[PDB]
Amino acid sequence: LAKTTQPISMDSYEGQEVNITCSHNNIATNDYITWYQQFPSQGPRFIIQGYKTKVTNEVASLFIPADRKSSTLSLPRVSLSDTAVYYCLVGEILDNFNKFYFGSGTKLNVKPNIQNPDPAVYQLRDSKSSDKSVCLFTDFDSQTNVSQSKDSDVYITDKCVLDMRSMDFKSNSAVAWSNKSDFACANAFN
Amino acid sequence: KVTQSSRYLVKRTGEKVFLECVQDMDHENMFWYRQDPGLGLRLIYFSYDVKMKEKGDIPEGYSVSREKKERFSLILESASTNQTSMYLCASSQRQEGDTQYFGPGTRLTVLEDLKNVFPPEVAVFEPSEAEISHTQKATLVCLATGFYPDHVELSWWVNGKEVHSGVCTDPQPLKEQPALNDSRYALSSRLRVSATFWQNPRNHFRCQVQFYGLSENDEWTQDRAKPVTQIVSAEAWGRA
């Protein structure tokens, strides 16, 4: 194989073209360029392979410059579900396959473009008894940062995107709670 | 189709552990990898045919067997906590070796002791009236708390059928005691429905948490219930 170098991570918005560049300057004559895609909680899957000429299929395009010392994976109009690790592999193939070195690849994040941001913090009571509650920060735009809790007794989750698909509606949220009653949802994400 | 024998495993330090990779595609090539934070996907061992084996990049602590074409066994002769990982196998045909088909993954957690294994407690938090009024939508929140190790799968069930639309579950759990090495975990999820759907008392909403814990062969001596593999849920009916 030839050693590949690619960015550790990348950010994007739903609907855009995503381009991931891989560097492989010691590529040899009988090497091919292969990319795999790994969705959360799954193993990687093969998505595209090339030699010297542009390749396009249902999942991606692969551009290969004349010197073959780098290549670019182009993902079309990305969806939230394209949040995944993308691996660039360079080496011999078919009957002459030896091994892959996956490394860490490129972690791609895909954010929703929120149509009508409507940020709000809500308080929710336990169905079993309103002894416990949680705070919900929801409907904010995707550039809004949600900070981790600096306090050991307060829990604040990362943001999560849900998709009400029949309504063509997506929304961001984060949840916060504490093992104390005095906890105010008002300052929780503040 | 590539099968792995288990989805989750809890094992003790010093125990002999087997993970099976099975395929019936008559593939010549089979592979075992592990996947860790910051370290990506690393090759442990592979096999180009029946009774063949070759060490990968990180073979230390592992062995394998390939007695039958369909099965590639990963063997941990004496499990250690550093072997806690996500294990992924794959296979490929000899003439298409570079096209590897991966199994679904096996989470193995090795513990020195089973003392600190805990199932989740589960609670459902009912939608805010302020959200209902302002948006005509209604977000239920579920918390799975106090579980150890990080072996849960959370799902939502509405009127007895699993739902996916309107759901988001945290990709990663939070540590309840971040400074403690064997801190128990918490995980949250949201299910968002139309307000009028929540307002129907005939609608049943369940947050269901599968925990992968102890089995019958694990000993248990504490007074509290043995933290076996189990399904723990919390629920709410709709309200007007």
Numbering used by the authors:
A (entry chain A): 11 to 200
B (entry chain B): 7 to 246
Q: What's in the article?
A:
To further understand the remodelling at the TCR-NY-ESO-160–72–HLA-B*07:02 interface, we determined the structure of the KFJ5 TCR in an unligated form. When comparing the KFJ5 TCR in a ligated and unligated form, the CDR regions underwent significant remodelling. A more modest remodelling was observed within the CDR regions of the β-chain, whereby the CDR3β displayed the largest shift of ~2 Å upon ligation. In contrast, the KFJ5 TCR bound with a markedly reduced affinity of >200 µM, suggesting greater structural challenges to TCR binding.
Human leukocyte antigen (HLA)-I molecules are of central importance in the presentation of antigenic peptides, enabling CD8+ T cells to eliminate cancerous and virally infected cells. However, HLA-I molecules can present extended peptides (>10 amino acids), whereby the N- and C-termini are similarly constrained within the HLA-I molecule, forcing the central region of the peptide to bulge from the Ag-binding cleft. NY-ESO-1 is an immunogenic cancer-testis antigen that is spontaneously expressed on a range of melanomas and other cancers including myelomas.
